[PDB]
Amino acid sequence: TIVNRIRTDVVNVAKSFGAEYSEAVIDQIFQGFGEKFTNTGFAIRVQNKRNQKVDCNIRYGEAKENCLAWDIARESGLLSDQGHPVDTLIQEMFQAIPAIAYGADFDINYGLVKIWHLPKIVPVEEAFKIPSLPKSVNAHIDFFKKYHLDALCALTVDYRNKSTNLYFDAHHPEQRTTQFYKNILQSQQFEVPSDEVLEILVNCPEIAVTFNWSSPGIERMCFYTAFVNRETVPQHINPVLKKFAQEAPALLDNPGFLVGWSFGPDGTYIKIDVDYHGLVVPSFFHMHNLPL
Template sequence: MSAATTVEDVYLTIEESARLLGVPCSPEKIRPVLTAYGEGLADAGMVLSVATGANPPEDLDYTITVPATGPDPYAVALSEGFVTKPDHPVAGLLPDLRARVPVSEYFIDGGIVSGFSKIYAHFPGDTLPVAQLADLPSMPPSVAGNADLFARHHMHDVAMVGINYRSRAVNLYFAQLPSAFRTAHNIRSLNRALGLPEPQGPSLRFAQRSFRCYVTLGWESPRIEKICYAPAPVRDWDPSALPVLLDPRIEKFVRDTRCTYPGPPFVIAALKWSASGQHLNLGPYLRLSPLLRDLLHEVTGEKV
């Protein structure tokens, strides 16, 4: 399959999913991104996700893997005009990571309404401690400033860094979470330390199943802006096990989105807290990269 054919097939799948959700889909916002990264698209992993709460949903996010052996994804985003190079440390963070971190693959992230927003560096086989990441010249000082908080709450190994060029923020994805992280006491204490409501009931039980946890930090404030708890992806997802009620359109989107692998979709769900409240992100994997297949085999025991 040619790169152009793959781009068109992926775009049509996104368009179909947007129609299920009632989210407006503009080809001029999506096709240029798919085309720019199209050479690796045939073997790429891809997930669609939507935030619960808005009725109807306001946007549909897509996340696509980009091979580490290909062009610098930030250089591509700059050359295509998806981002502009600011006079700000955010511009230097991916180059700093590329020079010092053994990246396995990258991800690009955007919304079909809001446009291109993030690049992630993923290094699950070579997780790094917070102190090593804090030493990167372009990393926000808030990472080092919260190192003790992370350590107290059993958050040690970072497997991925996300860079949001639109909001000038960084996500640290903590992996290999020990059982001590998932205790009710630890999760409540962590949210309380961030000045956020303590999880209760179904939300607490959901957070206790975390496979990864990520935090959002910026350069302008020492505070952690957001925390997210994400259990491992599941194949046979159960809407009743989620800590929020789903709009029927979201449930239909998850069930009916067209995937390129056999069987029911693998589904991710992530529960987030920020100053704006609690919400859930939910969505299916459309495509599986070789690394994603390995990770899913590791966490689910199923070969795909």
């Protein structure tokens, strides 16, 4: 079955990369979400967040206007209340801004991590009405304006990290210059990457900015890129990129990949998703009004 092949592939990736994982957590995730994994925008992700360690995260999105993942995760005990502003945040999001899609991702050593809210691209101001948003978000209006972060294309709630991400369509001509990324990173005292990487960042269509409830400042920023096949992933930049590009499983032979470049206070690491069914990459390009 497709669900058995997905579960097998996930475990095979975990073992090949030495990623920590729990069979009981996988069993729980799949009891709730496995059928969805067969039918929707499913992806397997590895990242080198931890030093000398790879983490594996599985995720899916689907074009439903209600947050089905919240209901499933509540039902299966994957999401219980934690006495924290995250408890209602996704609900407020779906109440504040109409959604065209939703999604969810799961750490295979832990359980549900984030739930996603996907509107049509919308002015960032529509986010400011959300009651349980951390104060830092509205505190960063001038930052958003300055860096041309006006076109909001997604929102996520991270229940494990107790944080929230705003995602923007990087449509502005300034965002096609390496100087933009140098500046925005330097504005948070984040380490500026190599020139090679900067030249990759100029094509990033999506910029994620992380906020939380313990600090006034930006926790992290991530710049996402897509690649149509294994070959065009920059495999020379990092061993995890090469190995995953070359060896990630998918239902088609040459899947696309999504690469995120995350930067924080001196975290600064790489994330890579395989487009397991071949739907995610076209949807990424479409959502950012780019051609394949």
